[PDB]
Amino acid sequence: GTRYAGKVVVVTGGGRGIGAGIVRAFVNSGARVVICDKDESGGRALEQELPGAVFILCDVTQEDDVKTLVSETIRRFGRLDCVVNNAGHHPPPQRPEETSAQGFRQLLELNLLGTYTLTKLALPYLRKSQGNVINISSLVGAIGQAQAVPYVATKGAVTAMTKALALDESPYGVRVNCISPGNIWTPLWEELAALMPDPRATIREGMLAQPLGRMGQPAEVGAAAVFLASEANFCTGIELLVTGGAELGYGCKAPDI
Amino acid sequence: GTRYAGKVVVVTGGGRGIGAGIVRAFVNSGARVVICDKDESGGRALEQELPGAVFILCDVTQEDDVKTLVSETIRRFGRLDCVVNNAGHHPPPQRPEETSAQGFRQLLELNLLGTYTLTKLALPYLRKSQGNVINISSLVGAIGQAQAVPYVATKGAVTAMTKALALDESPYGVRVNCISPGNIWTPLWEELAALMPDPRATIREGMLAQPLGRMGQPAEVGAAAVFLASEANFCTGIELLVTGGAELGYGCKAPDI
Amino acid sequence: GTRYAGKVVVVTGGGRGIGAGIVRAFVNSGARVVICDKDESGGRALEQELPGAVFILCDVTQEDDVKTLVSETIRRFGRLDCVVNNAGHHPPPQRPEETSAQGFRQLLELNLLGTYTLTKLALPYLRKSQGNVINISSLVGAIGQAQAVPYVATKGAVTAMTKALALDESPYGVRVNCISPGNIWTPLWEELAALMPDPRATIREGMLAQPLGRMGQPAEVGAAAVFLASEANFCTGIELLVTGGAELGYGCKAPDI
Amino acid sequence: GTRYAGKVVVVTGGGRGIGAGIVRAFVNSGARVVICDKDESGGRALEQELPGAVFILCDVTQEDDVKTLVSETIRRFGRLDCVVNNAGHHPPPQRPEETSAQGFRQLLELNLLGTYTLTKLALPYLRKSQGNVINISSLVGAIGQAQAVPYVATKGAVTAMTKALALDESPYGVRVNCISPGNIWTPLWEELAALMPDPRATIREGMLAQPLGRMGQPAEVGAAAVFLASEANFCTGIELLVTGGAELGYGCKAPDI
């Protein structure tokens, strides 16, 4: 309850799923948390539930929303120590020929440029506090995924951007790291599975993609985020895998012709 | 002179630098090559110089230019076997706070979406020929670079997109690979160095960033591209490093406090 | 003080350096710790200093020493939750032609087979407790190091072995992870630097190999180990980098000929 | 037929499987090849079949055999340009608790130290010719494999050793690279499958572990080796994946508990 006491954290997309798990983990570590989300429902309830968390409506694709998010965080709490760029989306499975450049641009706006924009506006305050940035990327940025060309590209960009910014901000004492989750059971996972012919079979395949035989939990991503913020003082530019071992070994991906 | 005989290759940004080296390597392997570039000067001369290469003016950020590039390649040569997505740019060094979302969008349009667009329009023809895609990414997508947040992000996206598309096109027999060059001596390298306070010192630092103690040549990237196209039939989704060992070992990147 | 309460941890090479930092971190988390070392001096003092830590003399290259280490841990504390395989050595810099197969075998015995042997003897007890294995590898297993062919090979083996065992033990609920430190200021670092022509210059080069501009501390590796043991329940087979960003960007490793 | 004309290549384990494919590829490129193998049957026949290849009986675990291999290569052909360290073995699947330290030592002797020993004895001659080293590692050194702790560890060591030696030999102009094959259809693959309850099912699983839906061929590893030797002059310390995409995407490796 004291690992991150006295610190102020902003979590984007904090109203449900991984983001809400990260919010809870930081509150449990003693921090004050600003929950950013484009939707009011989950985040407002979380603000009522958790002493030490407050909700600010903010769409990270809207630069003026993000400017207000940062200025209100500083006005209300007087410092900013950690930004967790969690807001993002995975579209339904799409074959490459079914994608469009305009859909790709829109997904880049959320998954990549929203992370870029908040980070940029927050960095002057993170420099003052020797704070840190945590980006939520994805394992599939590293290893690929089927029927997800735009999504995979956006997460490869987030992971690479994390390393570039880590280099640039290292002289100023600001660490920049990312977490790459694998299959985490969240409302997005449940929504995507419900679109499939056999949702239950899709969910079973998702569980068995991990050597551990289950999906991950938001709380497990949250613990990884609290570690990076509060105890990983010699880590910058890392990609922390929270995947249950999905990237390990041979599997079903499809004699020598 | 026969490793890729009878095949038809499109090289974007083929008028100078790495692209021209790739053009030359494919012509030397027996292929017919379409040189795409937004600038006429280098590519037109290359078409006069090389029997088997022709020049088509085409800005890869302009979807209708790219549509015409593909339709003219098919009209003139009757097949398409390999697309090399080489067109790209590295801006001058820029501190993160000096970047803009709009500059970032513009660089994504070239380095990422131009590659996406040509690949999409070419894939129906590559399926017919069991052809392949070669994207020119960058080592710094993998390891980061200072003062280059947008550039690094675009190359992380290209490398990840390569793996996603490799998965999607594997059932159709179309391989998708990338080359990640390190420091290659090209007109872009020379132009960026000339902007620096001490261009000669910048160039010396660039040479010594490699264990091999020199920069790479366009011809060396070209040989790697010809290998991927013509002889790497069990390679898909790989990132072929052509970096002189820059990613190896400890170096100068900046007692325990 | 409660994150790992009630748990029992064995740390090899725990008498000084990173190992002692790991011992301290686990004691501070509420665990009981068995300090294994081949030398009595540091570990015996640490046992007097820390309530909750005890010292067992044990050379991890001697199978019967390791058998007794495990049986005494169980006899004295009734369970085993975590094994930290930290014992290892880095020889002085050696050019490849100055190495020997017999020196290579000896270093494999310590850095690789000692880790293998303790893990094997501990796994029946870790299965009962759903415990975990933490191996201390090295960044240079991943990126290489000059004048260290045998050492680098042993750490590449440890990191790979970690992933293999993670796969094998996943059905039994036992996680297997590794930490790859970069330059950590330890008595070994100080001893190796003292052998060099200009020890102070060697130490300065070591600090500047990190974007953060300093070396790491044993306490920072220890915090990473406590995270992996106590809060990383969806992590198995990962390589957690604790390197200060040394693997990022271009540096001094040595125009196109 | 001229890419590697006038050059002299040693291939260990060249009598069958991948090694024989590499021998054939180098002969087809114009090189003279010394086939090293511990067994006479395949290699002697290959020497009769291929003008430009000769067979030398040599067990790479026996230092005096390897000394004679190098001295006879120089005596008979007057130079040495490339060493391909292909000899190696994969034991039958073994659960971790079924392995032994002594079995692990024996596999290290072949897969790791045999590569080390030939490389060491060859390097004085490779320096004179600005030649290169190609080690045959494995994809599973990078991603792990089930029931193969010793094997995986040996290949992680080979890949890491490749990078270390690349650093050390870069000032002398000698490149050191590795190839990491995935599932390649070889007599070893066929022998291991025949040990399983349902060999045909094991082979089908092996094919489907690749997005390409087949296993690789020795000839495909051979083409990769010829590329590294003859045309990859700015590549050193790389790991060239010849895996059919097995490392890409999610698969079958085994809702959030």
Ligand SMILES: NC(=O)c1ccc[n+]([C@@H]2O[C@H](COP(=O)([O-])OP(=O)(O)OC[C@H]3O[C@@H](n4cnc5c(N)ncnc54)[C@H](O)[C@@H]3O)[C@@H](O)[C@H]2O)c1
């Ligand atoms: N669930 C997984 O398996 C998984 C795996 C790897 C990575 N990720 C990443 O984790 C993050 C969270 O995923 P999730 O599964 O929890 O998703 P989710 O859809 O359950 O939750 C996302 C939250 O972000 C909010 N959000 C979306 N767009 C926003 C915007 N423009 N501005 C502000 N808030 C916005 C949503 O309203 C929602 O509350 C995403 O970046 C995702 O790419 C998820």
Ligand SMILES: NC(=O)c1ccc[n+]([C@@H]2O[C@H](COP(=O)([O-])OP(=O)(O)OC[C@H]3O[C@@H](n4cnc5c(N)ncnc54)[C@H](O)[C@@H]3O)[C@@H](O)[C@H]2O)c1
């Ligand atoms: N030079 C290096 O060290 C280096 C290193 C790693 C990666 N790369 C990548 O290699 C590629 C080539 O780089 P280079 O150094 O040869 O650059 P360059 O600037 O010398 O050549 C690039 C060529 O692409 C053309 N081009 C640019 N924008 C275009 C567009 N919109 N449409 C069509 N053609 C366009 C240019 O006119 C030029 O002829 C780029 O993708 C770059 O990111 C270069």
Ligand SMILES: NC(=O)c1ccc[n+]([C@@H]2O[C@H](COP(=O)([O-])OP(=O)(O)OC[C@H]3O[C@@H](n4cnc5c(N)ncnc54)[C@H](O)[C@@H]3O)[C@@H](O)[C@H]2O)c1
């Ligand atoms: N210091 C670094 O920069 C660094 C970097 C990366 C990895 N590592 C790894 O971290 C680990 C600890 O390194 P360190 O710098 O603290 O070294 P150190 O030499 O300061 O401490 C090592 C400890 O292990 C003990 N030990 C050695 N051989 C042993 C054996 N056979 N049985 C039992 N105990 C034995 C020593 O007596 C000593 O107390 C090693 O595995 C090393 O390879 C260190």
Ligand SMILES: NC(=O)c1ccc[n+]([C@@H]2O[C@H](COP(=O)([O-])OP(=O)(O)OC[C@H]3O[C@@H](n4cnc5c(N)ncnc54)[C@H](O)[C@@H]3O)[C@@H](O)[C@H]2O)c1
């Ligand atoms: N087959 C695959 O799927 C695969 C995948 C990845 C890596 N590899 C690696 O490729 C290499 C070749 O494998 P393969 O499948 O062709 O095996 P193989 O068993 O079919 O052929 C190996 C050859 O090496 C020889 N050899 C073995 N021990 C030797 C020794 N001590 N001295 C000299 N020669 C010796 C054998 O007699 C044989 O001719 C090995 O290093 C293996 O680990 C193979």
Ligand SMILES: O=C(c1ccc(F)c(O)c1)c1ccc2ccccc2n1
């Ligand atoms: O959101 C999904 C996902 C999964 C793994 C990742 F690493 C990641 O970043 C996101 C997801 C969920 C459900 C799905 C269902 C079918 C197909 C794809 C699906 N993807």
Ligand SMILES: O=C(c1ccc(F)c(O)c1)c1ccc2ccccc2n1
């Ligand atoms: O274009 C450059 C570059 C270098 C390495 C890469 F891997 C890459 O993709 C591109 C470059 C050139 C010259 C420079 C000069 C100063 C700073 C950065 C520079 N970058």
Ligand SMILES: O=C(c1ccc(F)c(O)c1)c1ccc2ccccc2n1
């Ligand atoms: O022990 C050293 C070391 C450094 C980095 C690592 F990643 C690692 O595993 C071990 C070390 C110390 C001091 C030195 C001094 C000179 C040369 C090498 C040296 N190596």
Ligand SMILES: O=C(c1ccc(F)c(O)c1)c1ccc2ccccc2n1
């Ligand atoms: O030799 C095998 C192998 C496979 C993939 C690799 F990447 C590698 O280095 C070696 C192999 C063959 C057949 C098998 C059959 C069952 C289990 C494992 C098997 N392994």
Ligand SMILES: OC[C@H]1O[C@@H](O)[C@H](O)[C@@H](O)[C@@H]1O
């Ligand atoms: O909807 C799937 C899961 O999403 C998670 O974020 C919630 O914490 C779980 O209660 C829920 O089962």
Ligand SMILES: OC[C@H]1O[C@@H](O)[C@H](O)[C@@H](O)[C@@H]1O
């Ligand atoms: O401008 C730098 C270099 O660019 C390369 O693309 C050209 O082939 C070289 O002739 C030139 O020296």
Ligand SMILES: OC[C@H]1O[C@@H](O)[C@H](O)[C@@H](O)[C@@H]1O
């Ligand atoms: O010897 C170098 C360093 O080693 C570390 O393990 C100790 O904790 C430090 O007190 C010491 O300065």
Ligand SMILES: OC[C@H]1O[C@@H](O)[C@H](O)[C@@H](O)[C@@H]1O
């Ligand atoms: O035994 C499996 C395969 O091994 C390869 O090395 C041979 O070239 C093939 O003819 C054979 O089918």
Ligand code: NA
């Ligand atoms: Na509240």
Ligand code: NA
């Ligand atoms: Na022409």
Ligand code: NA
């Ligand atoms: Na004590």
Ligand code: NA
């Ligand atoms: Na012959």
